[PDB]
Amino acid sequence: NQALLRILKETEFKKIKVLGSGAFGTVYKGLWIPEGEKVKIPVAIKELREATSPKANKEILDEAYVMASVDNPHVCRLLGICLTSTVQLIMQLMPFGCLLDYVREHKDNIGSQYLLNWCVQIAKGMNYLEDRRLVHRDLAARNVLVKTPQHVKITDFGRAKLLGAEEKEYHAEGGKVPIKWMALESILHRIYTHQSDVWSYGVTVWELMTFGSKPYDGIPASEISSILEKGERLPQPPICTIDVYMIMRKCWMIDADSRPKFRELIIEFSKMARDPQRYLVIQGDERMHLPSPTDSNFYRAL
Numbered sequence: 001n002q003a004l005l006r007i008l009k010e011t012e013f014k015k016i017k018v019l020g021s022g023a024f025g026t027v028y029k030g031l032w033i034p035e036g037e038k039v040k041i042p043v044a045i046k047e048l049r050e051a052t053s054p055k056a057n058k059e060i061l062d063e064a065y066v067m068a069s070v071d072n073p074h075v076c077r078l079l080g081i082c083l084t085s086t087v088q089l090i091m092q093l094m095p096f097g098c099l100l101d102y103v104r105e106h107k108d109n110i111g112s113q114y115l116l117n118w119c120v121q122i123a124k125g126m127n128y129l130e131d132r133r134l135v136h137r138d139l140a141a142r143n144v145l146v147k148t149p150q151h152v153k154i155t156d157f158g159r160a161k162l163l164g165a166e167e168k169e170y171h172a173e174g175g176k177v178p179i180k181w182m183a184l185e186s187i188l189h190r191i192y193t194h195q196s197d198v199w200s201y202g203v204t205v206w207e208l209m210t211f212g213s214k215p216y217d218g219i220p221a222s223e224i225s226s227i228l229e230k231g232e233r234l235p236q237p238p239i240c241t242i243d244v245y246m247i248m249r250k251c252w253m254i255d256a257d258s259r260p261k262f263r264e265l266i267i268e269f270s271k272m273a274r275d276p277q278r279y280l281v282i283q284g285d286e287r288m289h290l291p292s293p294t295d296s297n298f299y300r301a302l
C-alpha cells in the first residue's frame with residue numbers, strides 16, 4: 001500500500017556477503033526475516049561509513065522517513081533501517097546488478113525494444129524524483145540497477161539532495177565529482193538542478209546506445225569543461241537514428257532552460273519504444289533474445 005519505513009532489530013536480518021563498497025560504505029547481499037512474520041526476503045544492506053561527526057539518531061530517522069517515502073517502480077526503494085553503532089539501510093535487492101555491466105555483458109543480445117524501454121523507465125523514475133523535489137546528482141548507467149532484464153531502477157548512494165519549496169538549485173561543496181556525466185554549470189560552479197540531472201540522463205542514454213562505452217574515453221576530466229565550451233559533444237552512436245541523437249543533444253545544451261524536461265523525455269521515448277526498429281538500427285535485432293518468463297511457452301532456451 002503506502003511506503004513506510006520499517007525499523008529493524010539486528011535479530012531480524014543477516015548480511016550474507018559483500019557485493020561492493022565505496023566512499024559511502026559497504027553494500028551486502030542479505031536476508032530479512034521480519035519478526036513474527038514467517039517470511040524470508042532477499043535484500044541489499046548498505047552499512048554506511050562512520051562519519052567524523054555522526055548525526056543524532058533523530059536526525060537519521062528523519063532523513064530515512066523521507067527516503068522511505070520514495071515509492072516508484074523505477075527507483076530502488078528503502079525498505080527499512082537498523083540503527084546501532086552503525087547505520088544499516090535495508091534496500092530492495094536488484095538481482096542482476098548494475099545496468100552498465102549488464103549491457104556490456106549481454107550486448108550481443110540486446111535489441112532496440114530493451115534499450116528504448118530502459119530509456120523510458122529511467123525517465124519515469126527521474127520525473128518522479130523531480131516531483132519529490134529530489135535532485136539525484138549522480139545519474140549514470142552504473143547507478144541504474146536491474147530487477148529483471150525487463151525492469152530497471154535508479155539507485156542513490158548518498159549524493160541525492162532534497163530541495164525546499166522555494167529552492168530551484170543545490171549549491172554543492174568540494175569533493176570528487178563525476179565530471180564526464182555533469183552539466184557545465186555543475187562542473188564550473190557546483191550548481192545542481194533538475195535540469196543538470198537531464199544532462200546526466202543524456203549521457204546515460206548515450207552509454208546504453210553504445211552498449212556501455214566510456215564517454216570521452218581517454219580524455220582527462222580536467223579538459224572536459226573546455227571541450228564542452230567549444231561546442232563539442234558525445235558523438236552519434238552508430239545504432240541511433242538522427243531523431244534519437246537529437247533528443248540526446250538537446251540534453252546537453254549550455255542553456256539549462258533549453259534542455260528537455262523529464263516529462264517530455266517520457267513522451268518522446270515512449271513514442272519510440274512503441275516502434276523500436278524505426279528509431280534504432282541494430283543488426284539482427286528481430287532475432288535477439290534475453291531471458292524472459294515466457295521462454296518455456298515459446299520453447300526458447302532448449
Ligand SMILES: *CCC(=O)Nc1cccc(Oc2nc(Nc3ccc(N4CCN(C)CC4)cc3)nc3[nH]ccc23)c1
Binds near residue numbers: 098143
Ligand atoms: C556497475 C555498478 C555496480 O557494479 N554496482 C553495484 C555493485 C555492487 C552492489 C551495488 O549495490 C546494489 N546491488 C544490488 N544487487 C546486485 C549487485 C551485484 C550483483 N552481481 C552481478 C553479477 N556480477 C558478476 C557480480 C555482481 C548482483 C546483484 N542491489 C542493490 N539494491 C540497492 C543497492 C544495491 C551496486
